[PDB]
Amino acid sequence: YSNIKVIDMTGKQQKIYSGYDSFSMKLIHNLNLLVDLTEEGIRRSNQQLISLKDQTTALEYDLQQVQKSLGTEEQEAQHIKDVYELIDGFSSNRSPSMEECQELFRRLRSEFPHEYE
Amino acid sequence: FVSVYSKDNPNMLFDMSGFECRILPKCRTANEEFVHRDGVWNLQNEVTKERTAQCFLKVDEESLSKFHNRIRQILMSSGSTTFTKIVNKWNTALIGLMTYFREAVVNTQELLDLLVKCENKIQTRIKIGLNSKMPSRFPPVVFYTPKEIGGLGMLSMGHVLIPQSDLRWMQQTEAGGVTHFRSQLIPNLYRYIQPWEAEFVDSVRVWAEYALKRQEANAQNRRLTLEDLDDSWDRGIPRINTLFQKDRHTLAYDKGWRVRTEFKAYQILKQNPFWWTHQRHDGKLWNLNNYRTDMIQALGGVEGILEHTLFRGTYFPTWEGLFWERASGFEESMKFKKLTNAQRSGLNQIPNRRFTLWWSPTINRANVYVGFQVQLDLTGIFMHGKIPTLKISLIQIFRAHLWQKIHESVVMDLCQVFDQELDALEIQTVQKETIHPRKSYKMNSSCADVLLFAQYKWNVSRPSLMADSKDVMDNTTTQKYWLDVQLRWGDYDSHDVERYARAKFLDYTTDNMSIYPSPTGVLIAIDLAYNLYSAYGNWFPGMKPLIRQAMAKIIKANPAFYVLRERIRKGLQLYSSENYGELFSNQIIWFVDDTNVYRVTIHKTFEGNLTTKPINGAIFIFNPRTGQLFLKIIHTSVWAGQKRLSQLAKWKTAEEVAALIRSLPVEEQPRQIIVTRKAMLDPLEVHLLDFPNIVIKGSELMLPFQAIMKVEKFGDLILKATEPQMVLFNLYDDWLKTISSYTAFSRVVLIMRGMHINPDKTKVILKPDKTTITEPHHIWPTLSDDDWIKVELALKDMILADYGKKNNVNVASLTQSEVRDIILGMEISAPSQQ
Amino acid sequence: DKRRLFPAWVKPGDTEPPPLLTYKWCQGLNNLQDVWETSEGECNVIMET
Amino acid sequence: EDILAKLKLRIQERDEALNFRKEEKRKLEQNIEENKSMIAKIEMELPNQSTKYTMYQELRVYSRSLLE
Numbered sequence A: 001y002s003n004i005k006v007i008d009m010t011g012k013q014q015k016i017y018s019g020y021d022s023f024s025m026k027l028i029h030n031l032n033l034l035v036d037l038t039e040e041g042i043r044r045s046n047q048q049l050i051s052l053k054d055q056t057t058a059l060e061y062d063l064q065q066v067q068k069s070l071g072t073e074e075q076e077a078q079h080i081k082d083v084y085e086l087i088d089g090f091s092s093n094r095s096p097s098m099e100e101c102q103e104l105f106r107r108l109r110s111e112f113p114h115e116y117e
Numbered sequence B: 001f002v003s004v005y006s007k008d009n010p011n012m013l014f015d016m017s018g019f020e021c022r023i024l025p026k027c028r029t030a031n032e033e034f035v036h037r038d039g040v041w042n043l044q045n046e047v048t049k050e051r052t053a054q055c056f057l058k059v060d061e062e063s064l065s066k067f068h069n070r071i072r073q074i075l076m077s078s079g080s081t082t083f084t085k086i087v088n089k090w091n092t093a094l095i096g097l098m099t100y101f102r103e104a105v106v107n108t109q110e111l112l113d114l115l116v117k118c119e120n121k122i123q124t125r126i127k128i129g130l131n132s133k134m135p136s137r138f139p140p141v142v143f144y145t146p147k148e149i150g151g152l153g154m155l156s157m158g159h160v161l162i163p164q165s166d167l168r169w170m171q172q173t174e175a176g177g178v179t180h181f182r183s184q185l186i187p188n189l190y191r192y193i194q195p196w197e198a199e200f201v202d203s204v205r206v207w208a209e210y211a212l213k214r215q216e217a218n219a220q221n222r223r224l225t226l227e228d229l230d231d232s233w234d235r236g237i238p239r240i241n242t243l244f245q246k247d248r249h250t251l252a253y254d255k256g257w258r259v260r261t262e263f264k265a266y267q268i269l270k271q272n273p274f275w276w277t278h279q280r281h282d283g284k285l286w287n288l289n290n291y292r293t294d295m296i297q298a299l300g301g302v303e304g305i306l307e308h309t310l311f312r313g314t315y316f317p318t319w320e321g322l323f324w325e326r327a328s329g330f331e332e333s334m335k336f337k338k339l340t341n342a343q344r345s346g347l348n349q350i351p352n353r354r355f356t357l358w359w360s361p362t363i364n365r366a367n368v369y370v371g372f373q374v375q376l377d378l379t380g381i382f383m384h385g386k387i388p389t390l391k392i393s394l395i396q397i398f399r400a401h402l403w404q405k406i407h408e409s410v411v412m413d414l415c416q417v418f419d420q421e422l423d424a425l426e427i428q429t430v431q432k433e434t435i436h437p438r439k440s441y442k443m444n445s446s447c448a449d450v451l452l453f454a455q456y457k458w459n460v461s462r463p464s465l466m467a468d469s470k471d472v473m474d475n476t477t478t479q480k481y482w483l484d485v486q487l488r489w490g491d492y493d494s495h496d497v498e499r500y501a502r503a504k505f506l507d508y509t510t511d512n513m514s515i516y517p518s519p520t521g522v523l524i525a526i527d528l529a530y531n532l533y534s535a536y537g538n539w540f541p542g543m544k545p546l547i548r549q550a551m552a553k554i555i556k557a558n559p560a561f562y563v564l565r566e567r568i569r570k571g572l573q574l575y576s577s578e579n580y581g582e583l584f585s586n587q588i589i590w591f592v593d594d595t596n597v598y599r600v601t602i603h604k605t606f607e608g609n610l611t612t613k614p615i616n617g618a619i620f621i622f623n624p625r626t627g628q629l630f631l632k633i634i635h636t637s638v639w640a641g642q643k644r645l646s647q648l649a650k651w652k653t654a655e656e657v658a659a660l661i662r663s664l665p666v667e668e669q670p671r672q673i674i675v676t677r678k679a680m681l682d683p684l685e686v687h688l689l690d691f692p693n694i695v696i697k698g699s700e701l702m703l704p705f706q707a708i709m710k711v712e713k714f715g716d717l718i719l720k721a722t723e724p725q726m727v728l729f730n731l732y733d734d735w736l737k738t739i740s741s742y743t744a745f746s747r748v749v750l751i752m753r754g755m756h757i758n759p760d761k762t763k764v765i766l767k768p769d770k771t772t773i774t775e776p777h778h779i780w781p782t783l784s785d786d787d788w789i790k791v792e793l794a795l796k797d798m799i800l801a802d803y804g805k806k807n808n809v810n811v812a813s814l815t816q817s818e819v820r821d822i823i824l825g826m827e828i829s830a831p832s833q834q
Numbered sequence C: 001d002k003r004r005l006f007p008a009w010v011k012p013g014d015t016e017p018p019p020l021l022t023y024k025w026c027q028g029l030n031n032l033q034d035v036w037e038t039s040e041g042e043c044n045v046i047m048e049t
Numbered sequence D: 001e002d003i004l005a006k007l008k009l010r011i012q013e014r015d016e017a018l019n020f021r022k023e024e025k026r027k028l029e030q031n032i033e034e035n036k037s038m039i040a041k042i043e044m045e046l047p048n049q050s051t052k053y054t055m056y057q058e059l060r061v062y063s064r065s066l067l068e
């Protein structure tokens, strides 16, 4: 730990230290210009991300059209009628006379033919 | 056998390869004609192009008994065996029968009755394996549910009806009511294997048209474009995709392979059901992914299946992203090393514990011929049969009075609501009653748990549900009101907290035993197995929307539910799987790389076998903002006297960088370490517990620091080291004076990716003029700021040309962001994987 | 195989799975000329052993 | 007259499947609007990033000249 060779090539001339302890105990304006230069890339990255956000609207907007408006709302509208049709089929029945039977089966067979069969 | 066809005997019988076959020349004899049984072949006369005769298939009685005896062998070999291992053998036997005989089975009604019998027997073997001699507690869903949803994944050939009752699910509404939800036979496998007639006729046309598509390839001398065949890919008796099998330069020479696999019966004691085929020569002649997907649909979808399971007890938010643990250590290894038949069967029971627990709301459903209401001690659970391991499993969940602890927590959490609404409800006081400790699980009768005294009476509604938003709120007046809170643990037959809350309220309010201090109140019910809640009773103004709001808040955040939920999860084994600008911020950040640390070289020997020699390596630690590089050489002496070297190498990488960090002042220690291999995160974490201020993140981008060994200033330096010395470098050869860190950083990435692709072309790029040199005080050749741009463009083109060659894509197809991400090594390969 | 030792009637050949062999048999059987004719008392007998 | 009882079952069954699609409609609409909300936020940042970057372009030139 205390006696493992450290070779220093970080500077223009070479140095040698006995170990990490001897090593461990051996402008900003310009740096900030480098920071300024980096921020140009940040908006470049975000604009490209905004292009992905733009495609994200395409995903979202097609989900509105295909998934919600077409696929869901159409099957909604069809079967919600079928519920009320089948409830209406249930309503028709009870204690008829001769002509009441005729009007029942006229009504059942004409209006609800699939359910009737 | 001899079979004779004549003007007297019209049926030309024969029997080949297990297919019992009857031929009738329909041009001659008219006993049957073009009947749409699935298993009747039509013999197209090749020269006249006429259906001159029909061939009626059956499965011969020899192969019936070979199949039957295979199921018997699986049943005999059960004993202490897991249900998965049983049904995996059933599936393999069933696939073996079906994919061989195909349409012959469905014409063979005596086989189908046997297939029903065998399938039912495998089920019964599992039922009796769970001590459950009755139908009701074992509905189909337990068996046929695909095994990634923790079902057995059994395949079927039965007309096994799925009860229409068993598809419902229920979800908690925010209104405090419950909406039921929903979305027939279980699928026969037979519909998912293409019948042989279709396979053969399609194989003729496919290989015929392939000859024409190759004639185009022959005429143009073009590449055989797989795009021409992608519709044909899974067709042909030899599957056409075998043409592109990477082994095919050898498989051309494996002649006589089919008879070779049949004579294996005299060499290998383990019977093989796929003796008739070989996936590399025939291709894979069946694909059952559609059976798995459709099986979920028949069982009601994932939401409909999971009601049968304890999933709702976990209160995970969704099924997706969950996974099942496996490790094989301790599950199997210890039973191999230290066998003891009477004890080590408890290890083989570990999957059965999980399985039985997972299906608890179905396998312990109250609907029984008999059973008993054995209530579990200290608990409200009823244990309707002696199911082998569910009893111990549930005891470990509700251990240490958890049932009471839950009930007191919800009662006092209600108190903490009433204590803050007294004036709005016109309550003079709320009393937590002196609840006897049994009350939380004495199910036959109840007390009031919380009692309200009016300031000056309220008007009080007729009894109604919490879901009923409208009330006859003028029915009567009263000044005392009680709340009864009752826990529950449901099963799939009974977890409707609406009807439960009503029925227990109406019972108790007429029962003489009920210690209720007023004729008006509510019962609150909680299905602790499904995390559903409800209430029913009389309501005074302002009470119903408070309980509706308050009860949801409790379910969301109460701690006693959380410890229950974690115990269920830790019992089910069932777990949830859960930046480019940052590098140059004012923090101190080190990249670290472990791939070069332990390296071994291979050479031939006088023995002819190879041998392994370890060599010196290095840890690579690099600060991307300052360009400072710490190159800790790891010398082969640290591998001496050890053999677990790769895990040691991972430990020594984390240890030696921690030793460096511990030596440096805290003003120079990192605050983030970004690690280029995720396997190195965890040895760093356990080593860096002494420095909690350092966050450790997986790099997720890929940086090719492995390639630095190609640089002679590193290669010779690391190879020729006599000790594990530390060497310090800077990769920015004064660049931070003339250019910013980011472009200097990007230049390193460009150079490193370059030499990883090819050192010498990089050296060519880094030497545009032969008069350029590398100075000894530098690492890179000396170049001007514009010359650096010119070689960066050459490196960028070199990277993209290698990417294009590796991916068959034009560089011009790539946008500025894509070429950046390719330099960053991000996963750009297909849009279906992002 | 290179030297064509075995004639094509020697089965467990590399090109037919046994269910295709049953098909090529009854396909090849039906392709025989006059094979279903019995007008003058002609007969087919298939012998398996 | 048992068919009348059968209808109440199929009425419940059909209505109870209908409950799922209604909720399914609610789930789909919820996702879209959060994105409308969320993406609305994102495009509000787009001006702000434009304003930043352009000023840095000036302040790059300015600082680099000033310090020389």
Ligand SMILES: O=P(O)(O)O[C@H]1[C@H](OP(=O)(O)O)[C@@H](OP(=O)(O)O)[C@H](OP(=O)(O)O)[C@@H](OP(=O)(O)O)[C@H]1OP(=O)(O)O
Residues within 6 Å of the ligand: B366, B367, B368, B493, B494
């Ligand atoms: O599945 P089934 O054969 O139709 O039997 C059930 C079962 O009857 P038991 O009381 O004998 O168990 C129910 O009980 P559980 O399975 O829930 O314990 C019961 O529900 P109730 O106890 O609430 O009546 C139900 O009754 P119903 O048909 O009114 O739903 C009843 O049918 P039977 O009373 O006709 O046997």
